[PDB]
Nucleic acid binder design. Structure first.
Ligand SMILES: Nc1ncnc2c1ncn2[C@@H]1O[C@H](COP(=O)(O)OP(=O)(O)O)[C@@H](O)[C@H]1O
Ligand SMILES: [Mg+2]
Length: 71
DNA sequence: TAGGGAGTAATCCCCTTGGCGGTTAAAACGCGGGGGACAGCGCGTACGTGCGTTTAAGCGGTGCTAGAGCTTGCTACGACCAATTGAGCGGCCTCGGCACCGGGATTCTCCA
């Protein structure tokens, strides 16, 4: 499980350094809904942005990008 | 000898076309009547034809000088490019202009 090891890094950055992102996961498109479920399973506290869709749906999702906070 | 171009097919985002459903507003259909199209008529005046006059346009001829058209010389200036930045484009935001509605007031029509 390379997925769950990597997620446990972000959970360590959260648990140890209070870094709750922003965290970017890039994956192949067939992986997206899978990894979304995987991160939801392994770490329920991470709010996940499922950034895919037609242009208008992504344009709505960009409203969630906070540029003010680096952590 | 190697690099990057040619071939090709899978991958995945963008976007234009087409269908479904309603519903609703605009196109289609009817018909009376009116008034405007249009033919037919009278007159008169205004425009084409003709003749004598004149006027000046057009052709042949002379003389002049301006200025179009060309050659020469040079330097000013705009093409050129490498370095620098700030004006202006693309994305995001919000509030106020304007439209759309409703109902009461003034205008305009048309028949008496
Ligand atoms: N520590 C674990 N506990 C339970 N299941 C795990 C653990 N680590 C991995 N898995 C399971 O392994 C399966 C495949 O793991 P995954 O990380 O998706 O493989 P990959 O390395 O190809 O990403 C997933 O279904 C995941 O749930
Ligand atoms: Mg994986």
């Amino acid at each position: 499980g390379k997925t769950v090891q990597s997620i446990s890094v972000m959970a360590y950055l959260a648990e140890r350094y209070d870094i709750w992102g922003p965290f970017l996961v890039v994956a192949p498109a067939s992986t997206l809904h899978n990894w979304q479920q995987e991160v939801s399973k392994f770490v329920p506290d991470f709010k996940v942005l499922p950034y895919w869709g037609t242009a208008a749906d992504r344009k709505v999702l960009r409203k969630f990008w906070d540029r003010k906070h680096t952590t």
